[PDB]
Amino acid sequence: ASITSVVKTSELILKSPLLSKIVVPLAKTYVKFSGYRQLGFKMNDLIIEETPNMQLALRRLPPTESYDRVYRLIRATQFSLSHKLATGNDITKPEEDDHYLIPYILDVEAEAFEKDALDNLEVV
Amino acid sequence: MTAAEHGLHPAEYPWPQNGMLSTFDHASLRRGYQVYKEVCAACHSLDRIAWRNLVGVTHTTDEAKAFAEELEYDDEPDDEGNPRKRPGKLADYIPGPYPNEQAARAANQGALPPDLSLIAKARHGGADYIFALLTGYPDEPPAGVVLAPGMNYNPYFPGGGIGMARTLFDGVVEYEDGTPATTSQMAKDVAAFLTWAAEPEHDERKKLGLKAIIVISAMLGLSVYIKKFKWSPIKNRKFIYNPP
Amino acid sequence: ATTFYNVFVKRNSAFVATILASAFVFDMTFETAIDNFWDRINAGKQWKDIRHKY
Amino acid sequence: MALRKKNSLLNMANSYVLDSPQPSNLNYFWNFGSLLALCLVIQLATGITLAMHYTSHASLAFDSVEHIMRDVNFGWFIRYAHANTASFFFICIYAHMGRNIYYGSYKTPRVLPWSIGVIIFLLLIITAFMGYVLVFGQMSLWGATVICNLVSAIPWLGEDIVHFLWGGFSVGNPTLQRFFALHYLMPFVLAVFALLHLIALHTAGSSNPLGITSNVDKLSMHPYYSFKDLITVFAFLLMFTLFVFFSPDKLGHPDNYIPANPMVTPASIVPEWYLLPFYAILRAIPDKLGGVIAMVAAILILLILPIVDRSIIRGNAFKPISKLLFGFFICNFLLLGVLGQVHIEPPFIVLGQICTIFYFSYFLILLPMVSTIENIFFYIGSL
Amino acid sequence: GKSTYKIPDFTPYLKKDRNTDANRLFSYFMIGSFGMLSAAGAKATVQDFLSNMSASADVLAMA
Amino acid sequence: PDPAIALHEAAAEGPCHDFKHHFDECVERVTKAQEAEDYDHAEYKEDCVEEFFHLQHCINDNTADKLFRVL
Amino acid sequence: YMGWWGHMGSPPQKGIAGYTISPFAARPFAGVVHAAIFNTFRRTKNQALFVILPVSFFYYVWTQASEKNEWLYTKAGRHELAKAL
Ligand code: HEC
Ligand code: HEM
Ligand code: HEM
Ligand SMILES: CCCCCCCCCCCCO[C@@H]1O[C@H](CO)[C@@H](O[C@H]2O[C@H](CO)[C@@H](O)[C@H](O)[C@H]2O)[C@H](O)[C@H]1O
Ligand SMILES: CCCCCCCCCCCCO[C@@H]1O[C@H](CO)[C@@H](O[C@H]2O[C@H](CO)[C@@H](O)[C@H](O)[C@H]2O)[C@H](O)[C@H]1O
């Protein structure tokens, strides 16, 4: 699935009062049991990067964000190979789990999908 | 399927060879050969066993040569191309009671007694099945069982009706080592002998396995030390990050 | 420890020679030790134990 | 420049076994690849050796296997090693495929190694099936008969194809001799495809248990994974030792110690354990051709995992719901295995159908739905 | 935390006698033992395995 | 004589008495049913194989080790 | 998506200092007892439900099916077997 589709569907749910009332609490529990925060990851660190679109989005990250992401990946890799969890300041707090990459990939995909549409335009 | 259609499952008997470190009891193998020779060999072949196979397992070279030399085997034709017989040699296979299947079935009311060389591997249960079958003929079939003609009731046999009658009775064999030849004793001995016949490498295999287990275990332990030794710089790695 | 290291370990040629010689010794002694152990745990059962009767 | 890099031949070995850059966090489930290579080497060594003593003619085949067991020095070992390693090969391959499915190894950019892998799995099945026939015991013959008669379901030409495969009107000498030749060949074909899937993998490198890039933090294949592979090699050899030396017939069928007899039908004709799940799937469909299609589809459906997994994240480490679903899928696959060897009797008939439906619904319904929902939960949950 | 000249704490892992010959010799004893068992195991494996090609029991019986 | 005879008898009267009794009760019933006329033209003819199996399985569990100890 | 040593395809790295010590300088089994007990317990506890739930469900299903099958092929199960076929 494209990030675009995920974001759009999520926004439909957040709009609906009833839907959000059921989904938001479930999503928050899911994220707690997912346990990526216990390796010091942000959610966006987990997104598959081996696509043209995502490589382009990563290149557009501000240098600081980019350097910090590299460190989080290396740190998580070290926790993984040691079979340890993050402790203290290494644990990602909910307020630190920011969607730093989502705006970049949404722009990359917006252009890519517009290009696909316009490649199929028919002069009326 | 009904339990009857499967056959009763044999008990697990404590065979001397049960046990990772245990050989066959060779005195039991020798006695079991004698049961084979005096009882089973009337109807059953042991075609995969040669006289040489007994040597240094159950018999000396001389005893086995004596068994072979008592028999006649087909020789190569003479100079006029006429058939000839010769005395047996250690290389010869133990001869069966029948020339072909048809003769075997004619002597056994249509049933074919199987070759016993692999029978311990060819039946679920192995030695336990052989022992249970030979000792498991009740005097009377359970009320309601209808046996087909020439069939005998034996609960261990699938379906219950076997073409082989009970053959082991107290004192049908006189053992040469003075052991009392009860039904149970003879069944145990012959089951051991047939287990050996199916897997003659058994004793050597388990001893080599002991050696392998020891070497491989030690190598496993050492490989753990060496892996941990080599990996410790990676496991012990520490980082200090100063965001640029 | 220094002496031992210098003679048998430092040069890989020497280390490999020592390992191979030790493997030879191990192989021969292990064989003998297992043979004896196997014969003791399976005492009275093997052909070699009953052979004398025949 | 170092010779290992300069010389083109040495550099190819170097690129795969020494300088190959690996993730630093591969867990023990990444050790099954080298165990599969070990099984393949054992099967080649033992198989070529058995071929020096085996006779493929139906009048002599079963007896040549007894000759190996009884007369050939260490023939018992070589035979038992070959027979037991065939089972270990399937244990390792299921573990390897299980790892691949759990960790999303099938996702872009590794669709090609996964797809070649699916073919390797099919080749292994064919290899092992033909090797089993070579004994020419009761299970050999009757297994060959039943399995080759599935080809009769091909419309119009099926019967003709079966007679063509057999080289006659039933399984006999011509069948045995051709299975020998093809059983010898197929492991070489399998080695080639194994090499191809590794070359395909080398463009992206190994995935890792976190599902993230490892480009940030690489470790040389040697010495790290060389010495880590030795641990599982010795664990494997311990398991091998316990079967080959202490219980060599535990995984086999006693009926294969009875010479093939076209007259007498064995009480139950079952495949070797590692084929049992596919046999259960076949039984679930009442139609003959339906059953064959379902059985083949059960393997070919692996090819659609790259499409039906809609996750924006690679692998299951961080996906609680996908981990539960995976657990149910695996246990269902084991239940199918068990149901492959029960008698066709109530209530196992209906149970086999339910388990078959569940098997296919994992790919077609559950994984696409669960992966879609988890995407939304990650996004909303972290807002 | 900030200074890169302050080495992180390695005291839980560091051996005091890290520079001694006894220290190195111990690890080479482990490596050497592993090489020794691998040599003995390879020799046993090769010998037992290749003996399949020597005259089988049925061939020796006819000699 | 055969040691099994005594061991089997002892196990039947002792630890496997319930099963012995089921077998017995079954036999009585079946023999009586065979005695009655138009038994040959019955749909279902009961046997006692099941009860026999339960008894023998029980005897074997209580005897196997004891028997091999005296051989 | 993967290069080679020197150009692996990492985003630019800066600001990370990495430290480690020689394998000869380290105790390879440091903290092994703590890890073997406490780490394994933590690791196992967190994954237990994902194994227990499917295993216990499918084992229960098998147990019920195998017990029914066994009962259907007894004398007592004659009538129920006749209907089932
Ligand atoms: C005079 C005939 C006869 C004697 C004596 C005899 N058998 Fe048999 N045996 C048979 C026949 C006939 C069958 C085939 C029964 C059938 O398939 O219904 C048979 C079958 C067997 C089977 C296989 C049962 C199965 O599962 O297929 C074994 C094992 C066996 N015999 C062992 C022995 C042993 C051990 C002895 C004596 C120590 C023995 N037999 C003595 C005639 C004999
Ligand atoms: C992927 C590799 C292989 C697998 C999975 C495999 C599998 C099998 C299996 C399951 C059997 C039946 C074993 C038994 O129960 O006795 C067998 C037999 C046989 N295989 Fe293979 N095999 C492989 C490679 C080879 C190779 C390369 C040869 C070379 C000829 C070979 C030659 C034989 C022979 C001659 C037999 C019959 C003798 C016997 O049963 O042991 N195999 N194989
Ligand atoms: C003869 C059989 C096989 C051998 C020798 C083999 C060997 C290997 C090896 C050595 C690796 C790299 C190390 C590892 O991850 O374990 C690997 C990776 C892989 N194999 Fe296999 N393999 C075999 C069969 C299969 C099959 C049947 C599949 C798929 C259905 C498969 C799919 C893969 C995939 C996708 C990877 C990449 C996994 C990753 O690192 O993320 N292979 N294989
Ligand atoms: C697994 C057993 C070991 C034998 C090796 C397997 C045989 C397969 C090798 C033939 C396939 C060609 O393999 C290809 O080789 C070249 C160089 O060798 C590798 O090239 C890689 O390494 C070299 C240096 O090591 C770099 O110049 C290059 O940037 C990098 O991509 C490819 O990544 C690999 O895909
Ligand atoms: C490059 C490698 C060099 C060439 C390799 C040499 C190949 C052949 C070497 C000898 C093989 C036969 O050598 C012979 O091996 C067998 C075991 O295998 C040994 O036999 C020994 O063990 C076996 C079981 O392990 C017993 O059944 C036997 O009673 C005992 O003597 C012989 O004592 C030895 O003489």
What does this protein structure show overall?
The structure is cut from a larger assembly and holds 7 protein chains of 7 kinds. Helices cover 37% and strands 6% of the residues of chain B. Chain B has 7 helices and 5 strands, in the order H-H-H-E-E-H-H-E-E-H-H-E. Chain B has a two-stranded antiparallel ribbon with strand order 1-2. In chain B, strands 3-4 form a two-stranded antiparallel sheet. In chain B, strand 3 and strand 4 form a beta hairpin. The N and C termini of chain E lie far apart (83 Å). Chain E is an all-alpha fold and 63 residues long. The relative contact order of chain E is 0.06. In chain E, 56% of the residues lie in helices and 0% in strands. Chain G has helices at 32-72, 78-84, and one strand at 16-19. Chain G is elongated and about 80 Å long. Chains A and D meet through helix 1, helix 2 and helix 4 of A and helix 15 of D. Residues 46-48, 50-51 of chain E line the site of one dodecyl-beta-D-maltoside. The PDB classes it as membrane protein. The entry lists the keywords oxidoreductase, electron transport chain, membrane protein. The entry is titled "Complex III2 from Yarrowia lipolytica, combined datasets, consensus refinement". Chain A: Cytochrome b-c1 complex subunit 7.
Question: Can you give me a brief rundown of this structure?
Answer:
This is part of a larger assembly, with 7 protein chains of 7 kinds. Chain B is mainly alpha-helical and 244 residues long.
SS-derived structural category of chain E: mainly alpha
Helix content of chain E: 55-70%
Question: Helix tally of chain G?
Answer: 2
Largest sheet of chain G: none
Quaternary class:
part of a larger assembly
Percentage of residues in DSSP E strands of chain E: under 5%
Proportion in helices of chain G: 55-70%
- What gross morphology of chain G would you assign? elongated
Radius of gyration of chain G: 29 Å
* Largest sheet composition of chain E: none
State which percent range the strand residues of chain G make up.
under 5%
Alpha-carbon distance between the termini of chain G?
A: 59 Å
Separation of termini of chain E? Answer: 83 Å
Protein name (chain E): Cytochrome b-c1 complex subunit Rieske, mitochondrial
Organism (chain E): Yarrowia lipolytica (strain CLIB 122 / E 150)
Subcellular location (chain E): Mitochondrion inner membrane
Family (chain E): Belongs to the Rieske iron-sulfur protein family.
